[PDB]
Amino acid sequence: LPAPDDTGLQAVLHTALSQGAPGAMVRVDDNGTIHQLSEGVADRATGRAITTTDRFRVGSVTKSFSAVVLLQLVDEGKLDLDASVNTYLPGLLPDDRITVRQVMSHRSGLYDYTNDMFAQTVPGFESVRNKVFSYQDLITLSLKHGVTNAPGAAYSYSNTNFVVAGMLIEKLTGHSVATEYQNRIFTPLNLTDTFYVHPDTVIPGTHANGYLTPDEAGGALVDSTEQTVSWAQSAGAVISSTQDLDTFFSALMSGQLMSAAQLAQMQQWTTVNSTQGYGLGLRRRDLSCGISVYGHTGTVQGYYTYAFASKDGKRSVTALANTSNNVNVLNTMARTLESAFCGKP
Numbered sequence: 423l424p425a426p427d428d429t430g431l432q433a434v435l436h437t438a439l440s441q442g443a444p445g446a447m448v449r450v451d452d453n454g455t456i457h458q459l460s461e462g463v464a465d466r467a468t469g470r471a472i473t474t475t476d477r478f479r480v481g482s483v484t485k486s487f488s489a490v491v492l493l494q495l496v497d498e499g500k501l502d503l504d505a506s507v508n509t510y511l512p513g514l515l516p517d518d519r520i521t522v523r524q525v526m527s528h529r530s531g532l533y534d535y536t537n538d539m540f541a542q543t544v545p546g547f548e549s550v551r552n553k554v555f556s557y558q559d560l561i562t563l564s565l566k567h568g569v570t571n572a573p574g575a576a577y578s579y580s581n582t583n584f585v586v587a588g589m590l591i592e593k594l595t596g597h598s599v600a601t602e603y604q605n606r607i608f609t610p611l612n613l614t615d616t617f618y619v620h621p622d623t624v625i626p627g628t629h630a631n632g633y634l635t636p637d638e639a640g641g642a643l644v645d646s647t648e649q650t651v652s653w654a655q656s657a658g659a660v661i662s663s664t665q666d667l668d669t670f671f672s673a674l675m676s677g678q679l680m681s682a683a684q685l686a687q688m689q690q691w692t693t694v695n696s697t698q699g700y701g702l703g704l705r706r707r708d709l710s711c712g713i714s715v716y717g718h719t720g721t722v723q724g725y726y727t728y729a730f731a732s733k734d735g736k737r738s739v740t741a742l743a744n745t746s747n748n749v750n751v752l753n754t755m756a757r758t759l760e761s762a763f764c765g766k767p
């Protein structure tokens with residue numbers, strides 16, 4: 423690979439601050455040489471600077487952790503990707519033909535309940551932040567809507583799919599998702615900054631605060647740091663660090679977390695758009711210099727995350743800006759992948 427471009431990374435972060443991120447940071451693990459940059463503040467009221475060791479909410483990057491657990495259950499013979507979800511969770515879904523593979527690749531047609539919750543950004547955050555939901559509650563919210571397409575027929579990202587994922591983990595293992603994440607991922611990889619504490623609202627240890635941008639342009643930012651994330655759970659509630667997400671996606675892509683057969687299933691790409699695919703709880707992004715990278719993005723209130731690795735896991739990058747509902751910042755932060763993998767233009 424090209425050399426990571428730290429000047430380019432620095433410009434990305436500075437642009438993200440100019441667009442409304444209080445803080446922005448990135449860590450590259452380049453085959454044993456680290457690159458780490460940060461600009462701005464973890465806490466905008468106190469002025470405490472953001473740093474690449476600050477913990478944060480990774481949002482939908484959680485889906486990759488859920489997918490790893492499920493694919494280990496497939497290795498163990500406890501789950502068949504092409505069986506019906508209702509085989510394992512009887513009566514859950516209105517269509518017996520919706521399969522586990524369809525759920526994990528967002529081809530199930532299940533409606534995303536979060537479109538109900540966040541029609542207004544800050545009011546929706548205020549409605550869910552201190553709520554505790556069961557998995558079934560969230561499924562029932564989805565099922566109030568008809569499915570949006572036939573099973574398997576169309577890619578349509580839906581948090582509901584990884585609420586089903588959590589339910590399947592807990593039913594088939596008899597344990598909580600937190601226990602399964604810990605035993606199958608966090609402990610074996612020594613991810614000392616990585617937690618699943620739902621429904622606790624505290625982020626353990628030193629952390630970046632999250633700042634939710636309101637829908638009204640120019641409006642005051644809302645501190646969204648402390649919330650249950652119960653509206654997402656196995657779709658969105660992991661806490662981590664740039665170092666730990668780098669370790670996780672390098673371990674995944676280098677074949678440490680499941681059989682080769684199941685990693686191949688995880689990497690069967692459904693088209694998202696002309697430069698992106700979706701596997702099983704895994705995104706592919708195709709970069710301008712003809713390199714593809716693998717991992718996931720996250721948006722949870724006040725945090726935008728990108729966490730991606732090369733095909734062989736030897737280079738990994740995690741970038742975080744502590745705002746959300748700011749599409750300029752979201753778009754800017756994607757450029758860290760270009761600078762880190764494609765290098766100087």
Ligand SMILES: *C(=O)[C@@H](NC(=O)Cc1ccccc1)[C@@H]1N[C@@H](C(=O)O)C(C)(C)S1
Pocket residue numbers: 480481482483536540579581657658719720721722
């Ligand atoms: C994961 O991060 C998910 N985030 C949300 O459900 C929160 C949300 C975001 C925007 C508006 C309303 C609610 C989904 N995953 C990300 C991702 O994969 O990058 C999406 C942006 C697709 S939402």
